[PDB]
Amino acid sequence: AVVATDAYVKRTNIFYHASSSRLLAVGHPYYSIKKVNKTVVPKVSGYQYRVFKVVLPDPNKFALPDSSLFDPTTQRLVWACTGLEVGRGQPLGVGVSGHPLLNKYDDVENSGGYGGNPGQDNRVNVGMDYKQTQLCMVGCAPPLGEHWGKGTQSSNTSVQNGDCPPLELITSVIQDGDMVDTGFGAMNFADLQTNKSDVPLDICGTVCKYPDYLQMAADPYGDRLFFYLRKEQMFARHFFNRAGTVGEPVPDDLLVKGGNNRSSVASSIYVHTPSGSLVSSEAQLFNKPYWLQKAQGHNNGICWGNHLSVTVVDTTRSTNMTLCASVSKSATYTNSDYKEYMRHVEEFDLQFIFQLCSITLSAEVMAYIHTMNPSVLEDWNKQDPYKDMSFWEVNLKEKFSSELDQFPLGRKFLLQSGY
Amino acid sequence: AVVATDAYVKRTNIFYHASSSRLLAVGHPYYSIKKVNKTVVPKVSGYQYRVFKVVLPDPNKFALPDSSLFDPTTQRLVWACTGLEVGRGQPLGVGVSGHPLLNKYDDVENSGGYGGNPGQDNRVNVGMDYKQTQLCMVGCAPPLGEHWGKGTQSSNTSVQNGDCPPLELITSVIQDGDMVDTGFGAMNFADLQTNKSDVPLDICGTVCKYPDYLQMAADPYGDRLFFYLRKEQMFARHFFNRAGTVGEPVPDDLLVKGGNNRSSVASSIYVHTPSGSLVSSEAQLFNKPYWLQKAQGHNNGICWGNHLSVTVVDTTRSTNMTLCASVSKSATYTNSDYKEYMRHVEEFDLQFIFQLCSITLSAEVMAYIHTMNPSVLEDWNKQDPYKDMSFWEVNLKEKFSSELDQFPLGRKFLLQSGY
Amino acid sequence: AVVATDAYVKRTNIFYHASSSRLLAVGHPYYSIKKVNKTVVPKVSGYQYRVFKVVLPDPNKFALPDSSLFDPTTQRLVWACTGLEVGRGQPLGVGVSGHPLLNKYDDVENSGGYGGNPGQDNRVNVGMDYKQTQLCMVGCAPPLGEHWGKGTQSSNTSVQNGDCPPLELITSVIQDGDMVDTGFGAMNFADLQTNKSDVPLDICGTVCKYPDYLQMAADPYGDRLFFYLRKEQMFARHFFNRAGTVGEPVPDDLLVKGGNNRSSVASSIYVHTPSGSLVSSEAQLFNKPYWLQKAQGHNNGICWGNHLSVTVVDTTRSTNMTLCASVSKSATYTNSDYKEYMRHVEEFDLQFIFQLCSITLSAEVMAYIHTMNPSVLEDWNKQDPYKDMSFWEVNLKEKFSSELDQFPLGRKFLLQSGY
Amino acid sequence: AVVATDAYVKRTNIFYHASSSRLLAVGHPYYSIKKVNKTVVPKVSGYQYRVFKVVLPDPNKFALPDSSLFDPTTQRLVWACTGLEVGRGQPLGVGVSGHPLLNKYDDVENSGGYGGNPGQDNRVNVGMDYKQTQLCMVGCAPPLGEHWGKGTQSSNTSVQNGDCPPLELITSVIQDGDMVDTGFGAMNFADLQTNKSDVPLDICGTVCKYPDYLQMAADPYGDRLFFYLRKEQMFARHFFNRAGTVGEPVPDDLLVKGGNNRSSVASSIYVHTPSGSLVSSEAQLFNKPYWLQKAQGHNNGICWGNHLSVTVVDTTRSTNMTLCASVSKSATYTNSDYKEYMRHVEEFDLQFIFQLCSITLSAEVMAYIHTMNPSVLEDWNKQDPYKDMSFWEVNLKEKFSSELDQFPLGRKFLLQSGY
């Protein structure tokens, strides 16, 4: 049986403050710009995931003003997350995405008559604004996400080229720079949409993942996430019709065949342009301190291994600025005289407040932990369990301080904690 | 270590009221009108910042009804801000901005077929309403803002004319008459948009700044801002496509080249017309007293140097009235018979309530202060630290009064303070 | 120093109820209809001000059931407003306004290409809905408003015909039948817009005033308004461009001249069609009793001179009904067979609750009052100070009654007053 | 003086439950369908009034389980309404109304140029959604409404055919099946709009009434309504211009005559298409029990005469379903093969909870009542005072029961009443 950390982890009055200070990300909203070689301008979209891997200093080395606090022979130290605040700079705004060649055939919302039939290539320049999403979740382990990917066909009828691919719910570790569901669902467009032209550039070549809350919530121990705030909204702006043969035509029993032009049923493969309504300060999730006092799982904010993963998604600041430089500052206004570009920006400032804890390594405690996270013990005395994955490394080792009243969150803390 | 002002600044029961009374600004919403020489009609936009430099009378001179209150040999007097109310006249409304030659090529929200390709100069007359914004912040030092400016290239490949300029987060002192982010982000359009036609006239030639909250909040002492109320909202009205060569074309791996007309991929440099929903009294920020009782920083409203900076931004009253005078009052309706103009207006009435404080200049106090703000001491016995900057000077020297019940805010005060 | 009425006005337990009962206004929404002589059908718009001059009976004559209550030799009687309720009939709805010849040249929200240039007279039939506004304020003096009018040029360069007129903030007494700001600001269109075609008929020939709250609030005594509820909301529906020469062209430094058609910069004199969102009962201001127990000013509801001014603005019931009568009831449907008309309606029912008060005329009281309102004394023992002004006279002399439980507001009162 | 029923009507602990059970109305939304003779398919619109005449059993006959409760010689029994719940079936939705030949000339919201002039008959097929309205009011007397009807001209200038009719505020008894104000105001379109084509079919031939709250509220006794919940909302969808001669042209002083096409001023008789925003459960009024504990009037829910009138208006369930039957089930899709129809539906279930009361008929009580409602006495020992009027008769005589816990409202009651 799993037990609440509150049962084998002694707490103290030692609190420290830590902040990563200003963090900037600056790139192209839709795709990375590599000079036909290496990546120079990285892809930085507002609809991207931000998974910060916050590294804390190992207290079992740290030099305290006191040292009579315990027996380094029978007990060990651990950092526990007391509260955090995800600072967010830059003004509020929405980000436009599009595709020069979107597979958007006919507008079905309100269309006059049964026009002709599409020939070859009817793609058109389309642009819209994605679904608004604000979310944040802390844990001592990377977050889990879900998306739909191409499955594996069994020993069945040879899949004639063009058959609808098999859907599979894939679970994975949400990494930094991953794409958020934008309104076309959480799926791997790269693999399920061969034409590379069914959704905006910023996602038509990757995967859009969605937090696998239900799975994490059932985590036996609860290291994945012991806190989370989600806020997503969206409505249907326009109604479209795709171009291309209809893999699965409309059944006869469902319609009354028409004559003349109508004799050729139109594409019944509908789609809609998503859109988030307005964004406002009132609904702002971040820039507000969150005090975790009682996790819903068994791990009550214990940063095992001196690690701490903070996932963040914020589209409320997705303005994609545009800038152009001239190349012929003289002719009378000539479009060719200029080069237009796309640049997006992200501004963070992660600040936390941790509390020193101890653990007397009794026979039984040693056992429970070894079954829970053998790593934890093996360290209290190597390779990275997530070396392949990519997270925004945030090193906070030389960033701790017990002078709480010297920092905004610290001040807020003392205040809130009454004493 | 920085200490809370509440530890070395004694408070009293002496309260005074002060108000700047009616303040008017009247000009042209988009640009200043100089008669080809000097500036006559100033630029007064609703989307402009209002940084009032409120000057208070030096209490260490002031003539009180009493004078036994202290020893002018060991202690000094300081004004502390207790509360204020930013009066706002004129009705509610929104302000239209535009550009006769905006670089708005094709509407991408919903466009028919793959039109032709732009030639030279396709600019069109466009008009929209900006992002709604209400904010206010007090401090004993000017506020800090952020915007993106043209950076400095290192000893790298010669920047071929037309290359995308380098972005740099510039920090600066928000001055009166500065531009607020309107939906196209906080950047210096003058420098990043060479064509001078990518955004409305009221901002295509200047900088749009955004409060650098995170930086001010981390102010070691906290003189920048000890109070602030922000409220911004906005949505995407229309989706546009710019004209001009695409500095960074869409990568091959992201699309399936098309033949015929489609063979020439369209501009994938999207943009959107911003818009603030409705404005209503319910969301009104101003015309309401704000009682600062416990600043979040260490400076609890102490107006060091007898100064006080009040920043204000209010677009809820940005109606840009129009007026026309005739030149041929007789002909049968002829457009040429009239000259149309643009005029905007702002109406303020800053009223405050200050509390007299004292400070015994002990050895240690003298030290702390000298490190904090040497100026403060050097005065208690010159050039302006912000002579170059421009603020709306509000002189309140002959405006103080201890007859609280004779003024609206005063009345409100007594009431609120129970006694 | 001004003193609170609560200091020299004794209160009693005598309360009376009074109501004006049903009040109807029925006319034309845009202009009055005079048969080329006298005014028959008056102008009754929803966006009109309603300033009721409520006349009360002079208690210093009134015949009470008791009369031992005081010495008519040393003290006088005064009515104090305890509470009121502005009854409003007719259903909720919005009112359409328009102009057959509005100076609306090109729609700038989204316009294709640089069309040609306007010739002479391009005015078009336009119609929209104004900014929603609900407000109400009581006082013993008429309300003050503000609007922009044509100023007076000093001894300067001869104002060449057509120069932009000089703006002046004019303060005035808001009279019944005045126009409310509708979204084009508070100004005197008659004088600032020579072409008579820049805004709807209901306002293109008059002034739109806005309550001068700030000025009234600073009223030394506070007889102007001791209570007020305001609720206004609005958004930008469409974006227009005016026709007529541009008095102040766009500065060269702000744009890159274009060649060809673009060589002639379009009118940069933008405007927007206002609109109030939906109206709903939830936001209804009226038909709810308001109990004034502690005025924000010094006059706590004392109806000096037995007068009482109640200003009201309510556009939530501005439906402009249409009706047509036939002239050839037989022909096969022929437009000429009918005459269409426009009629608006207003339905009020002002009910109050007053409290008898007394004032011993001591030497000092006599003085204070004589300085405050000499009239008040001169009466306690003539011409109208507002004879020229026009208010909706509401006589309540024969309308008082001490049988509170016999009237809805009375019942509400007893209830609310607990006893 | 009128006295509160609570003074002469003794209450008891006897409570009963009653419900009308399922009530269905099924017909045509716009007009009744009579087979050129008698009415078969009745008109059942969502924007119709529902005035239920709930008949209760006369307790002065009723057979109780007890009978020692009083002296049938000196006192009488009366039913008092304690609480009710208006059950509503069918899903939420809006109802479309229209007119094949609506007098809608030119769209004035945004129209290009000064088009030509209308000839004869320009009516067009128009369709929209009405203003949303939810209301409910109980009383022991039918509700009062108001609408504008054709008045009566005095001994004045012979009303030349076509002159604007005279408006009169007509008060009447709101009957079942009456029309609710839908956005074109409360008036008698049949009489004020001769062309029969100015508003949708469902109202162009009848009257739209609005509750005369103010009048009922002033009811000396208060039998009209001792409870009421109103909730109406609406916004302006489109702006129209009517066709037909302008009875009262625009005054010269208001405009600058134009000179070519413009020389003929267009119709300045504007109108707007109304619309209710979305409907949602959150704003649902019904399907919630209402406990009347203290009426605002003097009659605290005393069902004099064993009658009870319940008025209801609910447009939140106005979906107008469509259905078609074939007539040539074989040909290759041919419109003529089918007949389309219109059918609306209403589902109610009125449930109440009454409380037995008594009244000792003392000399004085007999008097008060005789003056109040002589009928009441004459019965305690004939023709219908509203025989001509039409209400939805709801007989609850055999529907009473003292087994409260056997019914939903009963259960809710016991719960709510704590005991």
Beta carbons of A93 and B268 less than 8 Å apart? no
CA atoms within 13 A on the CB side of C130: 35
Beta carbons of C233 and B121 less than 8 Å apart? no
Out of B167, B271, B274, name the one closest to residue A26 (CB).
Answer: B167
Q: Which residue from B2, B14, B21, B25 is spatially nearest to B392, judged by alpha carbons?
A: B25
CA distance B80 to B387: 24
Out of C213, C236, C255, name the one closest to residue B101 (CB).
Answer: C255
- In chain A, residues with a C-beta closer than 8 Å to the C-beta of C259 are 332-333
Q: Classify C222 in phi/psi space as left (phi over 0), alpha (psi -120 to 50) or beta.
A: left
- In chain B, residues with a C-beta closer than 8 Å to the C-beta of D259 are 332-333
Record the tokens describing residue A354, joined without a space.
């941790």
Tell me the nearest-neighbour CA distance from B279 into chain A, angstroms.
13
Search chain B and give the residue with CA nearest C253.
B205
Q: Are D305 and D375 in contact (CB under 8 A)?
A: yes
CA distance A155 to B405: 90
Record the tokens describing residue A129, joined without a space.
């604004």
Instruction: Tell me the backbone φ, ψ of residue D185, rounded to 5 degrees.
Output: 80, 175
Mutate one of A110, A114, A252, A256 to test the D interface: name it (highest D CB count within 10 A): A256
- In chain A, residues with a C-beta closer than 8 Å to the C-beta of B185 are 90-91, 93, 319, 321, 345
Strands C132-139 and C144-150: unpaired
CA A192 to chain centre: 21
Search chain C and give the residue with CA nearest D101.
C333
Total count of domains within chain A: 1
CA distance D305 to D376: 6
CA distance B134 to B150: 28
Record the tokens describing residue D106, joined without a space.
């030119």
Query: Resolution for this model in angstroms, one decimal place?
Result: 3.2
Tell me the nearest-neighbour CA distance from B172 into chain A, angstroms.
14
Q: Is A179 exposed, middle or buried (0-12, 13-18, 19+ CB in 10 A)?
A: buried
- In chain A, residues with a C-beta closer than 8 Å to the C-beta of D332 are 257-259
In A, what residues contact C, Cβ < 8 A?
Answer: 332-333
Secondary structure (DSSP) of D326-377: ES-TTSSS-GGGEEEEEEEEEEEEEEEEEEEEEEE--HHHHHHHHHH-HHHH
- In chain A, residues with a C-beta closer than 8 Å to the C-beta of C264 are none
Tell me the nearest-neighbour CA distance from C279 into chain D, angstroms.
5
Q: Classify A247 in phi/psi space as left (phi over 0), alpha (psi -120 to 50) or beta.
A: alpha
- In chain D, residues with a C-beta closer than 8 Å to the C-beta of A252 are none
Q: Bridge partners of C122?
A: none
Beta carbons of C270 and B127 less than 8 Å apart? yes
Secondary structure of A222-262 as H, E, C letters:
CCCCCEEEEEEECEEEEEEECCCCCCCCCCHHHCCCCCHHH
Beta carbons of C341 and D269 less than 8 Å apart? yes
Record the tokens describing residue B386, joined without a space.
């912000």
Name the neighbours of A, counting chains with at least 3 Cβ pairs within 8 A.
B, C, D
CA distance D334 to C295: 75
3-state secondary structure of A294: coil
If one counts every other C-beta atom within 10 angstroms of the C-beta of residue C201, the result is 23
Mutate one of B332, B334, B337 to test the D interface: name it (highest D CB count within 10 A): B332
CA atoms within 13 A on the CB side of D378: 8
Name the neighbours of B, counting chains with at least 3 Cβ pairs within 8 A.
A, C, D
Domain that holds residue C391: 1-419
3-state secondary structure of A361: coil
Beta carbons of D245 and C339 less than 8 Å apart? yes
Beta carbons of A338 and B239 less than 8 Å apart? no
Search chain C and give the residue with CA nearest B278.
C235
Amino acid at A226: F
Record the tokens describing residue C25, joined without a space.
């206004």
What's the helix, strand, coil split of chain D in %, to 5?
Answer: 15, 40, 50
3-state secondary structure of B43: strand
3-state secondary structure of B223: coil
- In chain A, residues with a C-beta closer than 8 Å to the C-beta of B5 are none
Contacts of C266 (CB under 8 A, 6+ apart): B100, B101, B125, C106, C114, C241
- In chain B, residues with a C-beta closer than 8 Å to the C-beta of D258 are 332-333
| Experimental method, per PDB record | X-ray
Beta carbons of B26 and C108 less than 8 Å apart? no
Beta carbons of C244 and B338 less than 8 Å apart? yes
Out of B112, B255, B269, name the one closest to residue A197 (CB).
Answer: B255
Give the CATH number of the domain where residue D277 resides: 2.60.175.20
CA distance D279 to B310: 44
Tell me the nearest-neighbour CA distance from D269 into chain B, angstroms.
23
Record the tokens describing residue B278, joined without a space.
């409705």
Tell me the nearest-neighbour CA distance from B81 into chain A, angstroms.
21
Search chain A and give the residue with CA nearest D330.
A256
Mutate one of D332, D334, D337 to test the A interface: name it (highest A CB count within 10 A): D332
Search chain D and give the residue with CA nearest A255.
D333
Mutate one of B327, B333, B338 to test the D interface: name it (highest D CB count within 10 A): B333
Q: Are C408 and D295 in contact (CB under 8 A)?
A: no
Q: Is A248 exposed, middle or buried (0-12, 13-18, 19+ CB in 10 A)?
A: exposed
Search chain A and give the residue with CA nearest C261.
A333
The beta strand positions in D22-63, using DSSP E, are 23-27, 33-34, 39-41, 50-55
If one counts every other C-beta atom within 10 angstroms of the C-beta of residue C132, the result is 27
Record the tokens describing residue D34, joined without a space.
């009579």
Element (H, E) at A366: helix A363-372
Mutate one of C144, C164, C267 to test the B interface: name it (highest B CB count within 10 A): C164
Q: Which residue from C151, C152, C150, C200 is spatially nearest to C179, judged by alpha carbons?
A: C200
Q: Exposed e or buried b for every residue in D208-233, given b needs 16+ CB within 10 A?
A: bbbbbbbbbbbbebbbbbbbbebbbb
Mutate one of B340, B404, B409 to test the C interface: name it (highest C CB count within 10 A): B340
Tell me the nearest-neighbour CA distance from D184 into chain B, angstroms.
25
Secondary structure of chain C as H, E, C letters:
CCCCHHHCCEEEEEEEEEECCCEEEEEECCCCEECCCCEEECECCCCECEEEEEECCCCCCCCCCCCCCCCCCCEEEEEEEEEEEEEECCCCECCEEEEEEECCCCCCCCCCCCCCCCCCCCCEEEEEECCEEEEEEEECCCCEEEEEEECCCCCCCCCCCCCCCCEEEEEEECCCCCEECCCCCCEEHHHHECCCCCCCCCCCCCEEEEECHHHHHCCCCCCCCCEEEEEEEEEEEEEEECCCEECCCCCHHHCCCCCHHHHCCCCCCEEEEEECCCEEHHHCCCCCCEECCCCCCCCCCECHHHCCEEEEEECCECCCEEEEEECCCCCCCCHHHEEEEEEEEEEEEEEEEEEEEEEECCHHHHHHHHHHCHHHHHHCCCCCCCCCCCCEEEECHHHCECCHHHCHHHHHHHHHCCC
Q: Long-range contacts of range B111-119, CB-CB < 8 Å, 24 or more positions apart?
A: B111/A124, B111/A125, B111/A126, B112/A124, B113/A122, B113/A124, B114/A123, B114/A124, B114/A125, B114/B261, B114/B262, B114/B266, B117/B264, B118/A335, B118/B243, B119/A335
Amino acid at A56: L
Search chain A and give the residue with CA nearest C256.
A333
- In chain A, residues with a C-beta closer than 8 Å to the C-beta of D333 are 256-259, 262
Search chain A and give the residue with CA nearest D333.
A258
Mutate one of D111, D174, D207, D254 to test the C interface: name it (highest C CB count within 10 A): D254
Beta carbons of D194 and C278 less than 8 Å apart? no
Search chain B and give the residue with CA nearest C277.
B278
Record the tokens describing residue C122, joined without a space.
């391009």
Out of B31, B127, B321, name the one closest to residue C185 (CB).
Answer: B321
Contacts of A391 (CB under 8 A, 6+ apart): A51, A52, A53, A142, A175, A176, A309
Tell me the nearest-neighbour CA distance from A100 into chain B, angstroms.
5
Amino acid at A183: G
Counting one residue from chain B and one from chain D, the pairs whose CB atoms sit within 8 A come to 8
Record the tokens describing residue C82, joined without a space.
């305890």
